[model samples]
Target: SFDQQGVFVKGYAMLGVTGPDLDGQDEGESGFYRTTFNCNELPTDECLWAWQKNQDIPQLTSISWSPSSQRTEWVYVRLGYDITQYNFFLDQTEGMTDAETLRQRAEIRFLRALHYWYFLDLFGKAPFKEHFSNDLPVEKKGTELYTYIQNELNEIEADMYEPRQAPFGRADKAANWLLRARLYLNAGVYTGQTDYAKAEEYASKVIGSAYKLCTNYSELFMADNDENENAMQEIILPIRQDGVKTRNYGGSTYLVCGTRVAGMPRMGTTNGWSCIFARAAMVQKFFSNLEDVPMLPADVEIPTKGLDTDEQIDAFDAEHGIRTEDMIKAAGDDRALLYSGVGGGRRKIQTDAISGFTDGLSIVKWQNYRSDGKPVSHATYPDTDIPLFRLAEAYLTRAEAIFRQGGDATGDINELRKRANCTRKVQTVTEQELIDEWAREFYLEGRRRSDLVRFGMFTTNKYLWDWKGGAMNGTSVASYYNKYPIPVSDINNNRNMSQNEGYK
Candidate 1:
């Protein structure tokens, strides 16, 4: 039977890295901007149009959504295969008397379940398999796959290590609880039925675990966050990235370099790629008003009251041009990490053509430096660990699940706001308001698309951003775009697998 290290070694190889590339192209922001969660357009290219704004719906036929899907799918399948193989070995091998084998089996099951969860979320199916073999397996979508994942997690819950008891960067009870909470949070989307009670229950389990929020929100994204005591306390599962040991072009390095523009802080890298940026509509979500404001020029001092109110912001924009960074600073939301005073003061609007490098406000949320301002281990490959699950998310999940059930979420919501040092506290929030709060807290963290889908906002013209659906003023597209088309290769090769509707 394989040992724990052997299991984890297989786990890291399959799940780690930036994911497989499309024709050797980096699938970092290139794949991410297609979703409405984060990013708008490449400042100088038209290739990403199909994803960025749905400009070429027919063109999607030519493109594989992201090569990463195939990579992610295989990772889960392989893990499951390995788990089954190890279980067989334990059953037949001589001298398999150690109780540790049981614990190892449970740990592998947890990892396999986590991978299946991702598969279910992205592909809407679990390509069921019980052995590592050459034969293709049939796929199960929707509730069938969801039920399988839920049952597997339930069976392994007692066997997994207790919260915080597992080695750092490994699966534990808290990780299992977090995954359960996530599954239930999207229960309404995955299955036709809503399960707010289960979502709340799982989320509360994580909250009661040893995990707690880091004092400063920004520190969680810093390079040496793994070294910070408070920050480490909050992170339940982190995709570990080390510049020296783990030299990946994707991971946090993609985040650190992708959002940076010319002349912005280096973020410990020799240069920044200046590709992705937050949409104006996403940035506007943090503001109180949605009215049009004048475009302001650089070099003007921001007004004292800042852009706290609609009229004041409009006036300030009219007088000094539309400085998005100044407006964010004026709004006083501690979560808004904007970099201004350089790179043309942050671009809030994207015109017909790809604009200059500074067409959108820079998200200075992630950096390759310690909270104490020390440099990372390597400049190009950052040391920052991408937080896959953390404590703040549990609180937010609890608040959202409670709110979905028509209950009060004020205490939970206020707790997060207080941590962010927000100048204002919200006593009551509508469904949309809680979603907005989520955007402010979790922007660019890879949760936006799911959250939007959960609220029935994704693929709806009800909420549109700049250049949405290929229009300068956003428009709506087909609802089927909500679930991505299954990879063309999978359908062609696996006779048992059928394409999702609309793609075929």
Candidate 2:
């Protein structure tokens, strides 16, 4: 039961909705999108920032120089604390036989390491607790926490079962490899020393494992994904969800319902919140030429000139020879699954306000039905297994390491493009070009914010999106926001804790 139920609880906290709604018009919309959009740039007129006007932008987006309240930090801390306690219980319980307890203990450490990785990423410092006890834990900051994560993973690596050898839906050697690769990839940000060679080594190991890319990318997110043999092959670790046996509002259910809105096709679910959307900047990545096009600001009135309807926009583009379809066609990356003409009107590329649902492009990434046209077990709770990791990330990580170390990245990068059936070959890839490829492949999978931070663009005016930094147009935020503050409440209650720099 611990193996079955443990990952589910962790997934909910890792990806669940938390926070207040903007403008009170949409219930919990702010909470849902704040988790998704705070780290990524928004391009629409009214989704995230537009949801609540006249209120100071959330610290997640504004990157407030001083502390206001905790955001992702609280979630990571709580999840880590619970996982730590569970591991302790597994170790101390005398009821279990020795062999059985050791096996379970190995699995527990794998799960604990997963939570600790998130803790380290969100908060550079973490509270150290070795056992389930009454005494309060003291803080472990910076390199101390980093070394602890490395040492723990190393200690547990031998005990964990081989890849695909453990039961389906349980952590094994492959999951351990994925976690190690992630830590090494971001080793520079975490420990001030980049280890591209080690990152590539671990990533390459996963690539050489049993996992292979699923032929159809769209099927990977559908309801029957767990049942499809190809879809299951690519998934290294999945947060399992069942509409009947396992019912939760957080994991894939939140993703399915949160993105479904008024005009889009039903995704086999009755509840479509329709509040979350893809930013224009994100959508532009799918096209070839629009990357340089200027985004519209929130305060400006939407211009109806030459673009009153989808047909009109098409006609205007045809006359000027600047069609979007042509751009998507020329780009040749099929991962961009965008839809338009909802409710008998054209979808505006430029979102001018945050209140309207139709201002930005709607994503068709996660669905609640199978490719065979069968509905899921329940309309509200989906059976789509939320992918914690896949093989594509390994290819990209290896390629990035090669590029960073001044080695040729064409081979690894082109391998992924070939899988996507990309029409044109990318002969060369700059640092920024490799970063853009990451967005094309991994958008909405919970990696955007960290990616932007690694590239040095997240809190800077160097790259602005619509309504960034609480401005109609984007503005620069304080760089100290790179790390979030320890919550004020935690500081008040814990005598041993101190806030991150610039938060005091």
Candidate 3:
């Protein structure tokens, strides 16, 4: 007889409750969001669903995961279910629930906040009903939702269990604090209340929690760097990819794939979920029109003019400065150090490792992949530990908030940049530029849209992918684009619910 009794769904449920597998990493069947690219390229329902939900797209094809059936419609139904369950899970734990169950619910809430926060950034004005609460009018709901979420985070943050290093990426007090810091930082934009001080308060909590900026820039994603390594040091959070729920190797190939090899997987790797090349606007912003640093040397060759082309391969390698296996081994423990100031030993910028410089097709940053013998195994399984909030970000957010509130960010912000070996003067950094740098440094961590709104630029669609049409569509001219619209289905089912102005 099979030991069927031992395999408890409750155990599975418990793991699902607190583990990364539930977010669709292990089975890959479910997750809050699907694709990370535009609808035009990876135009499956999954992509569209995630686009609607504002989640990062998984680049599966880069490693050649088969079964086109998996590429079917990207349904947002499960995303809705996850949201519903998350709310329900929280309701079940209102002091009456067992301590372990309550902890589980708190974990789910932390994850749910991350999901809701993502949707809020994408669709603009959304409904704010939980699994237990009755719906309310849009006017009544919109502003209050942000506050409610903020409160939920604040309440549970102190009570939540600190996850161990083995499962370090799991929701913990540090994570909750950082998320609240983010919400508070953007509270003004979301609710029309410029509570920069509150933002600073939350951010300060995380920054003060034994976290500091990493001096070594390249080691941020060095494959061998363990989760415990970050926990022990000043780093508060890093993406956790256990090669099970979070597929590490596949993502590395997606963003870091240069055109040197015969079948470079990064090019159209995810069946069009390929690395969206660096926007010209972002590149120009980095240069500041002061001098042509020439990230790529004149002699180096690029695989192609386009980032997807093979001609720009050499150029990409040259720009990014190829890090060989030996180099990583050499890095050893020193990998934890942050980038230092002028005359300090630092990792040289690999200008040649990037492509599309003059035309502005820079290599996508944050492209660390997992190395595995089986290539196809990479994509279907998730690996990248998508860190929603980290210490560096908290410090940066605090600095930005402090500066906005008319306080001194010079000390905090400079300390952050100095750790990264940024030679630029702190005095020279405009509040807007500091905000931009935050986005650049943490580019694809799923927080750009929100940050842009905090800076009051989301409606302008001023960054990478310009949105003239979205603007013409009459979305709120201000920072309303920071949050997303409530799902159409949600509005239809709940009569009490009302939609945001532009989305309706």
Candidate 4:
């Protein structure tokens, strides 16, 4: 929200910078790296490690942090004008503050809501930032940040940009629509208002644009073929990082470091830091057949082991109880379902171009891996731009929106099922079922928690990690976890600002 054009254009570029170091240099990465799941609940060993260990690093001098690692912290700071600023902006009659100019005011409002959207998803009803003029007392700030964000988005929906300007990344029409769909999808909790009608209105804007789902889901993340421009027209605000605004060495943190280790190597074909991973629950979901062919029993429970080692793969095999000879025999049967597809074995999605095996747990969405054999080195893996929003999401968003609006719960529920090439039956869908489909199609793109909460499932047992029970006896989690507590530094510096509930 800090004037995007202004921050990037004038004064200092350093002020806008934030996040935990992903280069194996920061102690914060250790906690995150040690955690097997790609994302985890706050106050977990992973989160406490980052917050207590590295939150105080000096701004510019510190190495760049991964946005995903300290996602909560980044989201907190991203809200340009906190609650006080909003009130002041709305109430101020004499001109405005340096950060509250009119031309960029709309943009700031949009960003504040967007940041809260992340917060509400991660930790629900978080600390509301009281006082648009000055930080308010923590006791008076209240814990309804989620409702505030929802209301704010609703207020700004009309003023937000039209669908045509979404691809640019700012708060355009499509971005607002995307957020609306996301919010409505989680409506049961936001205000007890499950308004699918609002969700559809926003979703339709992007679907009607010039966006189309990439024919190959793997192609969505091809760094080499980034020029193909297959992303939905709604993905306007892509972060362009190719050495100028972004650094190759810095950006390589997310890529495979080596074959032995997930982190890429420094100079070799696979040289870079390895950080995030696809969650085991999500991975299992992706590999599971919806038809209930029952590779594993309905009651069979998958262990929550991290997928960093070979033993994890063994566990997967054990859960399926597939014998080696049976796997070989299954490979020969065209009708047999493998982990990735009907014919492939444990292989999920195709990664190696030489193998030509498209079936298996393939991560073709992000361009971190090089299937063309260029060697994923520091030099090879540059700052490949990542889209925050896209057209494919728009289509899915529209589908969810329409389903929500009707409240009838019957129709071709898996509209996006066709796009993903999954064989979904065209039948009526409950609000819950449609929301679950979003997870199936968009897992690991880094929007799981928010999507879960929007569907009012964050506090349920269906998900892998529910935070509400403190530490649930079950495997999955449930909680109203949405917004994160305010950063410690912010609290220490500004007496007016208060920490969100649950942090203290």
- Residue 431 lDDT in candidate 1: 84
Please provide TM-scores, in order, for all candidate models, with all chains considered together: 0.81, 0.82, 0.65, 0.60
Error of 3 at 496 (Å): 3.1
Query: Using TM-score as the measure, which candidate wins?
Result: 2
- Predicted candidate 2 versus true structure: per-residue lDDT over 1-504, tens digit per residue: 345345434433333333232233233333333333333333212234324432233545455524444344334345545555555555465356565455566667667676666666766777667676666668888677777877777787777778767666767778888888888888898888899899899999999998888887777888887788788888888767677644443467656776666434444576776656666667667764654332323354433454544466555444433343343444576676555433213455655565554566666678888888876788677777777688888889989998999999898888878877788667997877787788888777777767777777777866777656656466777777767667666677777878887666
What lDDT does each candidate get?
0.63, 0.64, 0.44, 0.42
Candidate 2 Cα lDDT to native: 0.64
lDDT per residue as tens, model 1, 58-121: 2332222332244333333343444454444434433444656556666666766776666677
lDDT of 3 by residue, 1-504 (tens): 322223222222321222222333333334333322221122211101112222333322111111121321122233344565566555555565666556666667766676555444444334454665545423234356677677778777755776332145456777787888777777776677777787788787777665555556444543433432542354454444444444423333332332112223232233223223333234333444413323334454543335543345334443454322122222221221111111101112322222221222323233334332123334333333444345777778888887887777787767765665564657755766686566446654445545655665544534322111222111233333233444455567667656555443
Global Cα lDDT for candidate 3 = 0.44
By TM-score: ranked, best first = 2, 1, 3, 4
Pairs clashing within candidate 2 = 43-280, 45-351, 45-352, 45-353, 46-353, 46-354, 50-354
Q: What TM-score quantifies how close candidate 1 is to the native fold?
A: 0.81
> Candidate 4 lDDT, tens digit per residue, 78-193?
33334334444444423554532442455556665765565455445344553454444342222365566667766766655565443243456566667767776666655565
Candidate 2 ranges beyond 4 A from true positions: 1-50, 53-57, 73-77, 93-100, 245-248, 291-331, 343-346
Q: What are the candidates' C-alpha RMSDs?
A: 6.8, 5.7, 9.8, 10.4
Better model by TM-score, 1 or 2? 2
